[PDB]
Every structure is written in C-alpha cells, then in structure tokens.
Amino acid sequence: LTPNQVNDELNKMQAFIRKEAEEKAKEIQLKADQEYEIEKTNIVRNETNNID
Amino acid sequence: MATALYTANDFILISLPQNAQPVTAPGSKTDSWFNETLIGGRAFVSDFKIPEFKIGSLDTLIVESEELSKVDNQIGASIGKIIEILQGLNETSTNAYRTLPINNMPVPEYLENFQWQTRKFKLDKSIKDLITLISNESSQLDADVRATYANYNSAKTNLAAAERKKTGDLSVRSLHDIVKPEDFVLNSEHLTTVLVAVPKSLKSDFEKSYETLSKNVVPASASVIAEDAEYVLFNVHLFKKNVQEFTTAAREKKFIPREFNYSEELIDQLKKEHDSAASLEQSLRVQLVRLAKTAYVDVFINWFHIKALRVYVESVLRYGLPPHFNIKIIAVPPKNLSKCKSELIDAFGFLGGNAFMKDKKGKINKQDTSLHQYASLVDTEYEPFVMYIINL
Amino acid sequence: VDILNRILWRLLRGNLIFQNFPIEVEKDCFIIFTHGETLL
Numbered sequence A: 001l002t003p004n005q006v007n008d009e010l011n012k013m014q015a016f017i018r019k020e021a022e023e024k025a026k027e028i029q030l031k032a033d034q035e036y037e038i039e040k041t042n043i044v045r046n047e048t049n050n051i052d
Numbered sequence B: 001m002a003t004a005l006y007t008a009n010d011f012i013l014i015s016l017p018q019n020a021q022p023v024t025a026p027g028s029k030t031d032s033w034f035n036e037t038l039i040g041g042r043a044f045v046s047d048f049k050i051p052e053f054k055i056g057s058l059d060t061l062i063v064e065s066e067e068l069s070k071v072d073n074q075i076g077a078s079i080g081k082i083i084e085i086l087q088g089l090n091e092t093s094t095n096a097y098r099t100l101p102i103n104n105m106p107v108p109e110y111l112e113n114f115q116w117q118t119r120k121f122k123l124d125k126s127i128k129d130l131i132t133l134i135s136n137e138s139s140q141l142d143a144d145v146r147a148t149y150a151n152y153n154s155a156k157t158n159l160a161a162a163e164r165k166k167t168g169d170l171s172v173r174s175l176h177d178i179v180k181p182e183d184f185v186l187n188s189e190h191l192t193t194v195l196v197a198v199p200k201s202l203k204s205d206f207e208k209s210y211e212t213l214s215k216n217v218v219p220a221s222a223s224v225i226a227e228d229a230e231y232v233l234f235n236v237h238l239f240k241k242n243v244q245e246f247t248t249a250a251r252e253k254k255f256i257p258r259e260f261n262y263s264e265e266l267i268d269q270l271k272k273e274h275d276s277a278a279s280l281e282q283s284l285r286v287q288l289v290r291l292a293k294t295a296y297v298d299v300f301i302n303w304f305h306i307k308a309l310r311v312y313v314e315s316v317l318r319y320g321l322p323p324h325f326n327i328k329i330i331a332v333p334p335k336n337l338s339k340c341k342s343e344l345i346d347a348f349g350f351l352g353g354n355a356f357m358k359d360k361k362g363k364i365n366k367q368d369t370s371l372h373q374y375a376s377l378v379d380t381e382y383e384p385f386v387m388y389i390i391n392l
Numbered sequence C: 001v002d003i004l005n006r007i008l009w010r011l012l013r014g015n016l017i018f019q020n021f022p023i024e025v026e027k028d029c030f031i032i033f034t035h036g037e038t039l040l
Helices: A003-051 B030-036 B058-089 B107-112 B127-166 B200-209 B243-253 B264-319 B337-351 C002-011
Strands: B010-017 B044-047 B191-199 B223-227 B231-239 B256-258 B325-332 B387-390 C019-022 C028-031
Touching: A003 B058, B010 B264, B010 B337, B030 B044, B030 B325, B044 B107, B058 B127, B058 B264, B107 B325, B127 B264, B191 B200, B191 B243, B200 B231, B200 B243, B231 B243, B243 B256, B264 B325, B264 B387, B325 B337, B337 B387
Parallel strands: none
Antiparallel strands: B010 B325, B010 B387, B044 B325, B191 B231, B191 B256, B223 B231, C019 C028
C-alpha cells in the first residue's frame, strides 16, 4: 500500500479498540452502581424486620 | 441515474471528515468547491447536517451497518409500490408525489430543511430502537395501502358483474329495473312469467312460436321489454305447470330461457346488489386515495431517516475519528450525476484509500451480480469515500 | 484467495489489510487484520 493509507488505518484501528473498551467499561460500571444500592437495601430490609 | 424519474431532481448525499481538503483544487474550501467548481457551477448545495447518535461497540457496529443496508432497501422498495398504486389510480399522471408537498413543503425544499426530525425520533434513545421504530412504521403503512388497493380491485370486479346483470349481455342476467305489474304478473300463483333470451335473427321466430311452446300461453304477451346488440329479451306469461314444457320447447327452437319470476324479494335483492356494490367501491376509493397520500409522506420522512443514520454510522466505520463530520446534500440537475460522482471521487478518494480507489460513475441496479450495489451487508464494489446516490 | 478477499471486503466495508503468501493441490496463506470486533 501507501504509507499514508497504513497510518490512517492504524490511527482508526486503535481508536475503535480504546473506544470499545470505554463503551463496555461504562456499561459495567453503570450497572455496578445500581447493584450496590439495591443489595445494600436488601440486606438491611430483611434484617430490620427481624429486629422488629 | 434514475429509477422512477418524473421531473424530480436527483440527489447525492456525501459526508467527509473535517480535516479533508480536495486535491483537484488544492487549498480550496470544501463548502465553496461544491457550489462553485462542481459540474460547471450548476450544482445547487443544500445543508444536510445529521446530529450525533449513540454508536455501539466494535462488534455491535458491524451488525448496525448490516441492518441499515437491508432496512434502507425495504423502505425504498415499499415507497416504489405506493407510487405505483397511485399511478394506476390516475392520482399520479404528469407529475404528482415526487415534488408535491411533504407536510406543506415540496420535496427538494424539505431535504434542505431536513437535518433530523424530532417528531418521535429522539437522540436520548438508542440506535437500535431508532432502526426498529422507523422500519416498523414503514412496513405497517405499506401493508394497509396494499390491503385497500387489493380490496378496491375486487370491488370493481363485483360492480362490473352487476351492471351486466342489470342490462348488457344475457347469460346470467335477469332484469329487475324494467318491472311492471302487467308485463310481469305473479300475484297469486296461477300465472307466472318466463323470460326468454332470443338471438336477433331468432326475434321473428319467437313472435311466431311463443304460443305453441306449451299449452295455455297468454295471448300477445310476446313483446321486447329490453333489447341489446346480440340479443332481444322477451316476456311471455303462462301457467306455472306449463313452464317446464315451455322451457324445453324453447331450447329446441334454439333460444335460451333466462328464469326470473316477479317475486317481490327477488326484484328487490338484485337491485340492491347493484347499489351495494357501487357504494362499497365508492367509499373505499375515497379512503384509499387519501390513505396512500398520507402513507406516502410518512414513508418519505422514514426513508431519509435511515439514510441519514446509515451514512452517519458508515462514516464512523470508514474514517474513524473525528466523530464530527462535514455533511451536505447536493442537488444534481438530471443527467449530470455521473459527471458529479467522478469529480467527488478524484478529490476526496485519497482519504479512504490510496490504493482502494478506482474511478466510477452513476448508479446501476442489478440482480445479475451483487457488485455495484454499494452496501455493507452484501459484497459490492468499495467506494473510495462515503457517497450514496438517491434517485427520485 | 480472491473470492475470500472479495467477500471479506464486501462484509467489512474496507477495514482490512489482506495479504497472501504462497505456501512452497496448491495452497496459499492469508493475513486479514480485522480492525475491530463484532465481525470476528
């Protein structure tokens, strides 16, 4: 190929890979907060009714 | 080049990175080049700047392009059928509905003011739901327009059968609009009336024979109540028992009896059938012409929603970053498409490939090969930069 | 080799660096560089 083509195709390539990692990583951590909050409430809620 | 041309303008939708510069005019501006240089300045440029959307991951991205191609082609086809249903109805004859308003704004004027429509399609929603919503709307609308045009064609067929029954050709026809209390007697049961469908030659032959066909045939009843080109339609009154002898005797002479009595319910129901059939075709046709026109606009807004989406996502796949692109809709005057397409390829082609590039022109549609179809779901011939060709 | 090159070029719109090197029935090697995911 041409030098210009190959560097343009390398700069595109890693941009997708970093981007795929950011986008997946956001979903994991966005769900990890919903999970934190829920599970903390559940553990209390079960037990506060027992103390009652 | 064309695919359903009337007098509609043809459009090329292009998108580029914001670092791109033409090589055909070095150091020139992209926006200026499109209006000024491009096919001798007879190029009319309109805005068509598509917003950012929620782009998936890398694996999901392949699957997003595959579906945009398919859905695009469906909507494009389906609209082609709607135009046809109109063309046949004579609601599109010289020109109509390819330049006609699209919510009170003509088709070329509408594309320039088209930038994304926030009618129900949101940018706080996912890409996936945008493809599913738009495509569902497009399919569903086509199916209702198709169901009414089928029903209308059936309805014409019933009416046509009915008019001929009410007068035309005798072979199934019994008259019901030319009744009279004395040319058609049945009030007790002694007398009845038999009608005889007689060829024209045979008209004299009937006037002579009518009395002899059976015994107890009423005098001077034989008169032509109705007449058509092939046949003359007679009434004769006679006694009910004798109707069997009469009919058989009629068929030897080489007449054809048509049996109709003057029962009240008979006369009324045949008459009704003519009327009910005209009223069904009538109501339907008015709703059906209205329904297609209303469908036409909706599937138009929806076709462009996919293309805008399609082009955007593709741009992301081919150039990479920036996610901010310089996007235009260029109105080409009819038959300058091939010359326009080539000029764009020379300038901008280097960006998407310095070896993956060849000269090309126009748009040819085929099922001979899959090459030259410019799509990301089937193998085609790779374009050197993102360019999609719209034929109206 | 050519029909696999054309099918992968029509599947991945661009987005590949396809080579071939003849192995020395006759056969051939290939390198693709599928730049990304979800089509692997």
